[PDB]
Design a protein around this ligand. Structure first.
Ligand SMILES: [Fe+3]
Ligand SMILES: [Fe+3]
Ligand SMILES: [Fe+3]
Ligand SMILES: [Fe+3]
Lengths: 202, 238, 238, 202, 238, 202, 238, 202
């Protein structure tokens, strides 16, 4: 047997390799980005945005975020999805973005995911899996984003119920807002301190 | 074969989040322990990227940003295999890489080191592993560079890399170093790794038989990701 | 003989309160250092329990909860001596023990592991040491079990124990393991102990000469508590 | 010379061995409990109650507590007591309880102890020695409970005066209350954070 | 490829028939040396068993005899590969296994040990190896047990196994033990094997990466049978 | 290269794994047994029976026996048979039985095998290969059963002629008897002592 | 204390019955394995001998047979302790000894060796151990002697001894040798013992601090017998 | 823990130390012998005699024998006897003898023992424990002598029934004879070969 290669921080220049356009490098014709909505993509369009804060309450202006999620019917666009259901054919399910260098704000344009089966016949509430990489962070931090308008589904979610300190469950619920026609979910991540966001070892 | 969950990440084989010798980790590490969860379809799936979108020079850092000449520096090929912890090849995984130029200077707005910028070098590339888990790219060997942790901190030469493979649980970013660099024994970021054998797992080895005469040297570097167990009885993933 | 205070607890011989590899210790450990005090009558006294109250089967975990048959599992006797750090026997100390059954399942409302419950096994016992500090009890060897620290954490088989002896300062709760269990090298709770020689002080040894033919195996396990110094000059305790 | 056997956490199932009735196991005829008052016990009856909180401010619902104290005349029911005074013959001086699984509340029925001699001719203020065991706690945590109605005696207590950070001394004083006839002392223990309770290495 | 005979059994790699420390071998071992013969079609052929006849739970000793609950004991998966001495996989071989329950008690009319019987455990299973020579079964780890050789003889925990493969000459019955069992160093039956390296070939190893969280541990055990030589010149088998 | 896994005795409880019905365990629907004759099986039906004796001349009451043999035309029902001849399709060629716990008698219902080619163009006399496993026996003991009514073929058999101590050859010949219509071959095996049965290393 | 059975004799710590290098064992050893039985009152009891019957010189081989002078030879005292395998002293056990004289000649009708007989030496003695298990006797050191096994076989000097103690199961006869005798490495009877550490358990050691000036040397030799286990649960002996 | 001192043969001159009178040495006033009957000893007097034979069927003319037995009521004259019954006060229970140098015959004068409790409430048949020491014998050989006139008791004896090869049980039964008034039990011991006597590891 082999041991996993050890993690190391992505560092402050992670943009060069993962978001070259943010580092002002034009070298690829196709660039991976934060827009998961294609013209024929099914589902309700939503915007996910927030900031990542450090232990002093300051935003990380060099953090890189990726998200992974199912389509509107809760099917993943991956060969490892075993539901036997057809996935939306115009949906990658993944995106990557970087916080703005001056404000630290980050966002994604995506669709609201449908519920996905949990273990042993359970149903998970709608969620988006998210990972954070940055200078100072030695191993990408995994978390999940749930939606405050799915209170019923969140109350029965297996993973949220597996957090025994119940007061911490709320750090994983994003707040719905409607900026003139558009639905926006604000999800701020607090790496350390009060209201520290729950991070998972998955 | 019915696949079950990925084997648990062995936390003792990776650096801890809080590592005071790497100063910026002090305010960017959680104070609470991570919460371990049992895996679901969310953790065992991952996106698929098609080779169709990739350019012909996406894995050639010597030529992909070259405008009116070649970049200055040591011509090297890096190749190797990506496998999971049970030794199975990892096929069609996305490998993205980035690095400084021959001066130890990164092409990034926030790098102001005096090491000279090279107009013909960008420093980023990507490729998908093949059916045997093999990958190969060509580049200029990066130079070591100073950074501010302690005032005179220097990192050995390294190429940063990222992998998106078969399961979200395998998601990994790390970096590899070059055999014999004397700065490897001094780096606080490399020393966040607990064990000597894991620090050695990040060192690319000189591969002399694969040097190309009057052209380029070659380094060998394999990567190991978490692997899935097979299930033969109850399958509770769903 | 005029007794003085107990010798100071050697903090380097025990686990620290904060041990991040055992996740629940992160929020249940004080942030301040313990405040050491000079001992008074409060710390050198302790209650006395009379043997009169104990049942005839209180130290027989094979039969004390048996209803319509015997518990399933490996029949074993565990015995040994309780001494203080100066080698003196600890007499009439209360030893209480508890453990999972042969499946690694605890008879407790909060244990929902799939390992099967055994209707004829309870898992708790008690006894007082004799004048030589000796104790002996019989039980079913417990099975190792999974628990959630990292998701696939497993503890080697163990029997938990508690001692109330001559002084409140000696109060101790710990657990012992069985010689040769391969999980001993992997347990994060056992690894909270700093030194290899102290980790070994928790391993009960196979005692082959004391096996009972066609009946039960036997393990030997001695326990050492803090000891009092004698005083020959000023006695400031009071 | 020998080294002390190293401590290990009591774990979440500590009730099986120390409070079997709380784990619903009836195997002993005589069960050790939290009632230190016998019919002929001398002194004023008091109830001691509280909760133990973790670093998030949540109560520990699996903690086990024991207390050790002198009788009403400040004599310990132990052969190691050297005062040459007769102890109350109907007093064990010790008890054990477990926090309730749903609320985390714990209590003891005992009597208010008399003052005990301190070192070098001093007098200690009335107190009860208390120890805490639980999952996550590697070594039992020792503390003391003093009484707010003994301000005069507390101000001269050797151990309280040995804590050089004076603001922390108050974490060891329980508050007297009178629930219709009964005297109750509320003593909450905060393992970590603000107003963290003083713990001793005894 | 034209197959020739199986390579000769290396008698020094197995126990001798007469081994006085295992008392019952004294009257059940021949006094004459075995007569070695040159192999014929009789020795290189063997029967074929179809998977069609096997039940869905034939390799699941936890559930195949369960009536109103699960058996008590340590849940474990055992898996591995059967190969011939030249490293070739042994395909579609019949592996039959049997063992005592968690108490060290066998479900057999002649076993009267006091270790308790488990109404939900039978102790036997079977399976055919796959095309890679792989096999996997699940069971309760057996407990060690006393038996009468010397009066206080005890055997370490073990699972008995039998293999019928491609040639009658490969016919084998043996048993494997579990890593770390301290009784392995004392067993007279295991000590009938001459060499230390062959005694070690019967020890199943803890396979931690394959443990199933909150469920079962896993042991790895490979088996090697005699192999056939290929023929490139005269073929005298017939 | 690898060494063969070492043998160990099957022990007294070998029935559990190989003849569960004899140990009173019903867990399999299809149980392997000692009847090699199916309704359409070709050849003359015969019964093979005997006892296995130890060095004191007492029978082994815990021995397990298996036999392997060709069909009536001397073809083995195995892919390793290279004769290019069609084998009887209703014949397994193998069976297993256990001695009775009280008497030590064992038997098989099978058919008399045809002659099989030997090495270098020779012909072997009709025989059945037999192996013995039991407590006290560290490695299964291999032997062969030949038939006394095939004297001509036995006199030319390569394996029998390879035993240089000629007086021992007779221990491998079973005796034909006819129990009212049925043909029975009695083959007693003597593990040790006088008339000890020849055992082979094959 | 309720005593249970004696611990099983460890056959690997003694010579085997059949040991072809000691020729007379070939026809005087059983062919069958010994049958081990569970002990009864018969095996745990033994006779008691009273000190009243013993003569004042029964443990003084220098004077107990002396008629008109002292025996010729090296004056030595031998002393030591008899303990059981758990270290408990063996009290009031009967120790009987016998040996050749200084010439290696035994006072027996069947010894015709040319070594000279000593009219003042008999060669036998006896004593009972005291409450501490201690014994002491005085004698002439015996000389080594030739005997017919191979034609030129020679045994190192030795004193034969026999013990009847608390249980019939402890019954033992053996012999001890003297530190440094070069014949110890050559004796076929001593070589019937399997292990080097047990061969060394028969060597009496020079005890220089206990030599008596201008009188006698002294050797120290302790003896260990089988010991009884204590019972704390069922007592099936009766 | 300590290992038992290893055994060694008593050798051909064992008489010097254990039966000096047989080696013609008069040094002790009290000599241990083969007469267990004192004038006031209770029970029926019997003579036990026989020879010990080697593997060639020749008698051992240098063997030394001891016996240990209970009194007429089955009580042992040992402090380790826990029956709580009074033992015959004029009975040692042990004796020692040597085979005659020319004939190899040995004998004891003793009484017939009463039955002794066996384990777990059983009753053992009357027996005498016997041990053999001699040149060529590395460890004293233990055996038991039962009586042929106690067939009923022998058939239920725990130790005899624990010998699984039943034909060997008879080697432990001595034959009763009556030499003009005296009862004699003949017990020949065969160390090796046919009808080899059962020896125990006790
Ligand atoms: Fe870098
Ligand atoms: Fe536990
Ligand atoms: Fe077995
Ligand atoms: Fe001698």
């Amino acid at each position: 047997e082999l041991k996993e290669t050890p993690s190391q921080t992505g560092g402050p220049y992670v943009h060069i390799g993962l978001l070259p356009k943010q580092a002002n490098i034009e070298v690829f014709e196709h660039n991976l980005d934060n827009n998961l909505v294609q013209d024929n993509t099914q589902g309700q369009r939503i915007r996910l945005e927030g900031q990542v804060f450090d232990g002093l309450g300051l935003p990380l202006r060099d953090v890189l975020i990726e998200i992974w999620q199912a389509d509107t019917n809760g099917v993943y666009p991956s060969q490892a999805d075993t539901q036997g259901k057809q996935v939306d054919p115009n949906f990658l399910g993944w995106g990557r973005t970087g916080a703005d260098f001056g404000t630290g704000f980050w966002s994604f344009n995506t669709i609201k995911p449908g519920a996905v089966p949990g273990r042993k016949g359970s149903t998970q509430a709608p969620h988006i899996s998210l990972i954070i990489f940055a200078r100072g962070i030695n191993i990408g931090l995994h978390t999940r984003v749930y939606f405050d308008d799915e209170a019923e589904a969140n109350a029965k979610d297996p993973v949220l119920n597996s957090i025994e300190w119940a007061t911490r469950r709320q750090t994983l619920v994003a707040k719905r807002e409607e900026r003139d026609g558009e639905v926006v979910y604000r999800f701020d991540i607090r790496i350390q301190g009060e209201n520290e966001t729950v991070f998972f070892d998955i | 074969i019915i696949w079950g969950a990925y084997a648990q990440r062995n936390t003792e084989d990776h650096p801890p989040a809080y590592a005071p010798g790497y100063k910026t980790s002090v305010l960017r590490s959680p104070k609470n322990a991570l919460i371990s969860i049992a895996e679901t379809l969310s953790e065992v799936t991952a996106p698929h990227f098609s080779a169709d979108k990739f350019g012909p020079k996406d894995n050639d850092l010597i030529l992909n940003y070259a405008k009116d000449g070649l970049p200055i520096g040591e011509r090297v090929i890096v190749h190797g295999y990506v496998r999971d912890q049970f030794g199975r090849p990892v096929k069609n995984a996305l490998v993205e890489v980035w690095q400084a130029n021959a001066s130890g200077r990164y092409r990034h707005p926030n790098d102001q080191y005096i090491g000279a910028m090279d107009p013909n070098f960008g420093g980023c590339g990507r490729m998908l592993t093949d059916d045997n888990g093999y990958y190969v790219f060509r580049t200029i060997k990066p130079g070591p560079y100073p950074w501010r942790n302690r005032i005179n901190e220097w990192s050995p030469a390294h190429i940063h890399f990222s992998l998106i493979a078969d399961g979200w649980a395998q998601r990994l970013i790390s970096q590899f170093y070059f055999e014999g660099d004397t700065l490897i024994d001094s780096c606080p970021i490399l020393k966040t790794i607990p064990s000597e054998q894991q620090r050695r797992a990040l060192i690319a080895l000189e591969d002399k038989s694969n040097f190309i005469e009057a052209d380029s040297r070659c380094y060998r570097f394999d990567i190991t990701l978490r692997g899935r167990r097979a299930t033969y009885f109850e399958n509770d993933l769903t």
